Point group: D2
Chain length 362, copies 4
């Protein structure tokens, strides 16, 4: 049974807590033991440790990583703390489940990538949109030749949370803006579908410059939206965007792969639907709405009946299981810190391209 | 902490187990203790006890309901076992979380309802489609006057799990040990939603059909005795009209519990295959007039306990976590759970009334 | 060239004018001669005859039907005038394109049906929702065996043009001079579609409601006599089941004629608000299993006459050009026009039987 | 009444013929006189003149354009003939309704633009997707401040009419004789819509591909010389960002001209495959918050001329009736026709500028 440390209890902290709690319920084997939860202040950590089922809560994150009963550390803190916490966890001999993006800079991710190799421990980064049954089904369909050769990718990730204060808005805590917060997710899906990125040309904007209800000066330090044209190492084209100010959208990570023999389209706001076009007889020709069910990777561990909608949080249960199987030497987790470094190079290259008005080659 | 016993480990058993496991994570308080898991054969129970995180497994459900470390019993076994297991649990002084429908007949349900009344323990029935944030938001919107007075309800629940005529016959397709067909599997869920939106059913007029009448049975065929599909017109106690259907042979549908409430000042529409969307129409200025797509997020009941970010789709299994919490709070004396065995008996009467109406070609009043 | 008379210039009158104008553009042959347009008052008739391309306008419908240069008469006037105008046109030896419903009563429709048989002239009724490429494709798909045998129909027709309670009372809301309500305006259309997919209706059980019972009337108010909404359970002659509804007070809906046919081997579903989409489910291998969205294009009946490329949305008004062509062909002695007054009389019996069932609380058998 | 000449009878020729027939039916006034139809061969012209309701057919387009009974000429021929036919019509003193794109090159379009300005006759180009009630309603909503200030545009135009590699070659797929590929066929439409919503384009950075490089040609094989798809990042004169694409090989799409304008106070979204729907988000109370589906009806520009009841779907062909009416009004001096040949030349510059950017790997400024 894997011993678990959890650092942070917010959006992702609670998501990881629920995932670790049910990974064996869904996939079998032994239930992970919830050992230590870290958060500030201490009374909050004690409270959440009690309700989450952790053996203790502490205000000292170092206390979580150094617990001998811990085998794996979930890190769900602001981006500015990822590098320090992940390097400490790896040095401590712990496997690491790190939230995206890796850190603030390419240099940070490079140091982390080197630390991971030196430690001989497993790493996985929290790119949970790669875990839906629909997404995994799409990957397999492409590999099987269902849409022929990919000839164009178009992807977006729109939300509007910033169009209504967060550490996400600072360079010391968040790093990049929309690119770092949402863009990296789109990259994780995009490269899994299309292969590695060879070239980007990008542009960006900040639409809301100051948080109007903060009272004191509250300068937004990073971008609200960005777009890029892509060339993949295959030579194929892509379109790419992200935004945290696109009003009306809440989790609109949407993508499509146009192939020579068909098209696949997906929208995370309806994460249980995968749209597949393949040529057919004229009288019955059109896109198929594939509703998520037990034929798709991972779904049958949660439900034997199709159409009982798989949830956002259940992607994290799948993610936990992939890390669990990697730790046992039964599969390879993706992306590890090496695969993740490439993703960081992409989003940071997009940022560079937007700043300079020049294409960036990889 | 609440001591939990779980009977069965299938579709609903595993769903209940996931719910009990995460209920305090989502909603606070103390994590329930997973004491005893019951299933057959013994090896299976031992294995699933280990992976589900229950202190022990047993092949003897009676031991499970009798354990002094157990306070509440989740009953997820087949319909023909509900009555026996629930009456035993209640007689052992345990609260009960019972899967739908209550049993095979109204008479069984009445008998269980009588047992529950004399028990002074809390009961809840597994009508999980009433727990989605979208459904709960819709109920609140109607109470707040968002659509004015309801003037018509239209609901359906289509699935195709029995559509293939080569699927083998079973005792579940007999009236005796299977009870109702589509009305029992799906109809009861639609009633649970419908009465929550519209109030009590006063009258039904129904029709029903067995579409695939004979199915393969070791070498030859055997007759299917209960209905593949049913439809009904409704009058509510308010006088308001309704349409109602269910089907287990409706090809292409997987979990299409879909409903609509039309009112004097607007319309609400929902489809469970897209459980994170609620469609609301209210009159607006001509230039911007039209239905709104309300995407599930923390403004809707229960959602914020699972995720702070709107549009991160709430799942089918998370409905069961909400249901666990409602029972948990009822056990603590901090709110009534719905539907209890009394509320559930009325639902049983409605579905069996529809079957009676369909057999007679006559309306049935309640 | 066919000589055309047109009576009325409103919603359908202008629709018919546009149809007759482009029917040969789309389908070939000789453009019909637009000879006489009748409307009132006379100034409107003269102005519209000029802009519609008619040789002359008149305020006297009887003059239009008797003109020796006329072969066919479009009748798009209010329901109370249908019987008289159709009988006069037929007596004058003209073919008739009559707007739905046939008349205000079954009695009137029976007289019209006898008159049409007595004349040796073609008749067609304006059930234009049967003319879409999507609908005609659906019929052909079922005729190819695409969904096996139909086992259930579910149809609705929702609109909200009377939902506003301050809309004034009129004689159209009385039984005597208005006939049916929502069943007469909308229900007849749903029946036309329904029987085209499922065959003849054997029995109905219906309910109905006047939701807005009183409306402004010259300073005070007056009572609405006919129904704002109705619903019915259908038993088809084939033995199969159906659900049916209509409403003129269903807020947010504008032309929601929506139907589905569930079959033994698939399902077809359609919504007129998206008239260029037809949803087809057929069983498929599990990896790719699901409904197909069929977007209207040249593979569907009639579409290629208007556009060679798919996805260029076919319009509501182009249904009428198709309807005109079906009549032209029937007059020429090629195709048959459906529904003629005999086919139409049956539709009238069904909708009036629904109204009777709702009033009496009893099923009505055909 | 306006006298009409029609050149060509294909996809657009028949569409124009249907539009001219019903323009007065929808909008009033005098029905145009359908005088001369030109098409080849002569038998076909005579046959279609009859069924389309034109007084006569000819195989000599030059004769049709100089007929003194003709006031306006619809030109629906292939792109390589537009320049010659439009210049001759204008020189004969006729108004012109020209199909898109203008011609093969920017130089051709500059020639046509000069000819129109010299003729003092009205011109309109067939950008019919700017005529839908939904699109026109969207422009009005933006002008009224319904979504605040635009902060982003994302538009696409996907179809699959060339996605099948077995579909035969044509001279359309050469540079010399067909011009641009998807940019010319579809991109121009997307630009017409885009600039109407966002204003003029200041900069493009683009890329393009030929996906099917060869096609069957009467027993042999021939190379496809123009692009099957293209994408571009845009900066508008406003400073606002844009994404743009087109494709003739995007499998499963038939007329997927789809766009959205994201603003400071809301979002508008549209897809031509459901041309009767306009999606509008404006901030609302959290309990009811979300995009509205606005179904096309008489509150939207032009719809009421075709139908008095909402939700009776307006069709593709009816866009062309609206286009005809705009040209009639312009000819009568009671309205502006957009885009005329001057407006059209800007559209040509954008699409050819995208083509240039894709070839050079460098951004192209227009300012
Ligand atoms: N994969 C995905 O879908 C998502 C990923 N994320 C990522 O997860 C991470 C966390 O984001 P949220 O949960 O949204 O942030 P949050 O603000 O909701 O939570 C941050 C947590 O870290 C805790 N914390 C901060 N400093 C700490 C310290 N020194 N020691 C211990 N605990 C500390 C906070 O008290 C809080 O519990 C970020 O890296 C973010 O990019 C966030 C949301 C979704
Ligand atoms: N609320 C919902 O959405 C759903 C509810 N259900 C309900 O779940 C229940 C189970 O459904 P079935 O299809 O019958 O499932 P099933 O045939 O899989 O049986 C359920 C479980 O009961 C166990 N079991 C059977 N006999 C037992 C015994 N004597 N002692 C202990 N365990 C025993 C089985 O091994 C299995 O683990 C039914 O009441 C059904 O209506 C089912 C699916 C969804
Ligand atoms: N098939 C379809 O989709 C539709 C059918 N209809 C049908 O169209 C018909 C007309 O609809 P209403 O609402 O009554 O429209 P309405 O009240 O606009 O009248 C229709 C036309 O008849 C003219 N008219 C009335 N009395 C006349 C007379 N004595 N002589 C000559 N012209 C006369 C009117 O001026 C008007 O142009 C009805 O039968 C109705 O059911 C209406 C809308 C859609
Ligand atoms: N606005 C829009 O949505 C659309 C515009 N178009 C445009 O319409 C134009 C034509 O395309 P289609 O209609 O698809 O082409 P098509 O090839 O279907 O039709 C060409 C027409 O021109 C005729 N023609 C050719 N040479 C001629 C000559 N020398 N004299 C007289 N007639 C001649 C042909 O016989 C045929 O009638 C192109 O410019 C194209 O870009 C095409 C489709 C849609
Ligand atoms: O209660 C249920 O019964 C199953 C049929 O046994 C259906 O598949 C479920 O979707 C439904 O919730
Ligand atoms: O026949 C009809 O009647 C009108 C109501 O009078 C509706 O608005 C139309 O949609 C319908 O086709
Ligand atoms: O201008 C157009 O070109 C055609 C291709 O030539 C497309 O099929 C049409 O949808 C488009 O409007």
């Amino acid at each position: 049974a894997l011993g678990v440390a959890l650092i942070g209890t917010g959006f992702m902290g609670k998501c990881h807590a629920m995932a670790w709690r049910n990974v064996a319920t869904a996939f079998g084997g032994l239930p992970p033991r919830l050992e230590v939860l870290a958060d500030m202040p201490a009374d909050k950590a004690h409270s959440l440790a009690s309700s989450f089922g952790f053996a203790r809560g502490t205000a000292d994150w170092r206390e979580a990583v150094s617990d001998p009963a811990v085998d794996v550390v979930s890190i769900t803190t602001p981006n500015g703390l990822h590098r320090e916490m992940a390097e400490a966890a790896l040095a401590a001999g712990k496997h690491v489940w790190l939230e995206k993006p890796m850190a603030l800079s390419v240099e940070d991710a490079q140091a982390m990538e080197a630390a991971a190799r030196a430690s001989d421990r497993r790493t996985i980064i929290g790119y949970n949109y790669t875990r839906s049954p629909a997404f995994r089904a799409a990957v397999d369909l492409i590999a099987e030749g269902a849409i022929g050769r990919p000839i164009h990718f178009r992807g977006m990730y729109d939300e509007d949370y910033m169009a209504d204060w967060s550490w996400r808005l600072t360079r010391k805590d968040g790093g990049l803006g929309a690119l770092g917060d949402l863009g990296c997710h789109l990259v994780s899906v995009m490269v899994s579908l299309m292969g590695p990125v060879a070239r980007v040309y990008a542009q960006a904007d900040t639409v809301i410059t100051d948080r109007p209800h903060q009272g004191g000066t509250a300068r937004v330090e990073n971008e609200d939206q960005a777009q890029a044209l892509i060339r993949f190492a295959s030579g194929t084209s892509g379109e790419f965007s992200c935004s945290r100010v696109a009003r009306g959208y809440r989790c609109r990570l949407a993508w499509e792969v146009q192939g020579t023999e068909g098209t696949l389209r997906f929208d995370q706001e309806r994460m249980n639907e995968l749209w597949l076009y393949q040529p057919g007889r004229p009288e019955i020709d059109g896109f198929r709405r594939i509703l998520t069910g037990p034929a798709q990777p991972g779904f049958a561990a949660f439900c034997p009946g199709g159409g009982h909608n798989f949830g956002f949080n259940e992607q994290k249960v799948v993610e936990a299981e992939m890390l669990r199987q990697a730790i046992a030497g039964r599969g390879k987790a993706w992306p590890d810190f090496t695969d993740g470094l490439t993703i960081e190079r992409v989003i940071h290259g997009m940022a560079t391209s937007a700043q300079t008005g020049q294409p960036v080659n990889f």
